[PDB]
Amino acid sequence: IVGGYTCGANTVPYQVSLNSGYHFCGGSLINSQWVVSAAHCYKSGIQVRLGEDNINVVEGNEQFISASKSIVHPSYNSNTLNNDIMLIKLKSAASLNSRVASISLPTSCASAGTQCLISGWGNTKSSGTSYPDVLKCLKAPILSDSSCKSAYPGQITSNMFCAGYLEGGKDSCQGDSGGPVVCSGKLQGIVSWGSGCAQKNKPGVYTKVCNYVSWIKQTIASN
Numbered sequence: 022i023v024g025g026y027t028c029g030a031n032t033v034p035y036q037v038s039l040n041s042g043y044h045f046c047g048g049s050l051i052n053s054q055w056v057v058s059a060a061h062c063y064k065s066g067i068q069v070r071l072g073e074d075n076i077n078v079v080e081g082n083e084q085f086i087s088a089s090k091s092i093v094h095p096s097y098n099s100n101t102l103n104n105d106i107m108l109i110k111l112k113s114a115a116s117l118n119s120r121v122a123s124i125s126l127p128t129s130c131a132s133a134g135t136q137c138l139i140s141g142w143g144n145t146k147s148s149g150t151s152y153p154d155v156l157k158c159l160k161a162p163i164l165s166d167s168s169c170k171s172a173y174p175g176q177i178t179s180n181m182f183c184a185g186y187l188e189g190g191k192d193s194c195q196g197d198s199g200g201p202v203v204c205s206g207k208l209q210g211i212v213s214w215g216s217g218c219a220q221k222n223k224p225g226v227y228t229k230v231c232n233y234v235s236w237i238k239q240t241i242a243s244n
C-alpha cells in the first residue's frame with residue numbers, strides 16, 4: 022500500500038496473508054474454512070495465516086492453517102487478468118473471534134464514488150521498494166467505469182473496476198495482490214493489477230466480486 026496508514030493490529034480481521042515460506046499475497050476470509058484471493062496468486066504449498074499484524078513476528082493472535090485445495094476461476098485468463106479470482110479451502114476451520122472474522126459477500130455491486138478500505142503488506146513506495154511488516158490500510162473511492170476505461174484503454178472488462186486517485190500517490194501495490202477491497206462492510210474487490218503503483222492516471226484495478234457471488238456460493242457448497 023502506497024500513501025496509506027498503519028491499520029492497527031487486528032483491526033482488519035478478515036485480512037489473511039498467504040505464505041509459502043514467505044508472504045506472497047493477501048486474501049479475505051469469507052467463512053471459517055474458505056478464503057477468496059486473486060487467481061494470479063495461485064501456487065502450490067499455501068499456508069493461510071490469519072490474525073496477523075506484523076507478519077515477521079508471532080504476536081499471539083495468529084492461526085496458521087495449510088490449504089487443502091485451491092480453485093481458480095474456470096474462466097481466468099492470465100494474460101488479460103479477466104476473472105482474476107480464486108478460492109482457497111483451509112485444512113481445518115479457523116476459530117472465529119473479534120480478531121479473526123469473516124467478511125460478508127456483496128448482495129449488490131458497489132457504485133462509483135463508494136468509499137472502500139484496501140489493505141495489505143505490499144510495497145509502500147511507488148519508486149523503489151520497501152515492504153512493511155505491519156498491515157497497511159488505504160481509504161479510496163471506486164472510480165467511474167468511464168474514467169477507468171479512459172485510464173486503461175482496451176484493458177477493462179465487465180469483471181473489473183478501478184479504485185483510488187487519478188492524481189496518484191495513493192494505491193495498492195506489489196504484495197497487496199489478492200487482498201480485500203471492502204465497502205460498507207462487504208467484500209467488493211480483490212487487489213488485481215495496475216500500471217506501476219500510485220502513478221498519475223493509473224489507478225488500481227480490482228476484481229469485481231459481486232459478479233462472482235453465485236460461483237463462490239455454489240463452489241463452497243460442493244467442495
Ligand SMILES: [Ca+2]
Nearest residue numbers: 075078079080
Ligand atoms: Ca505475526
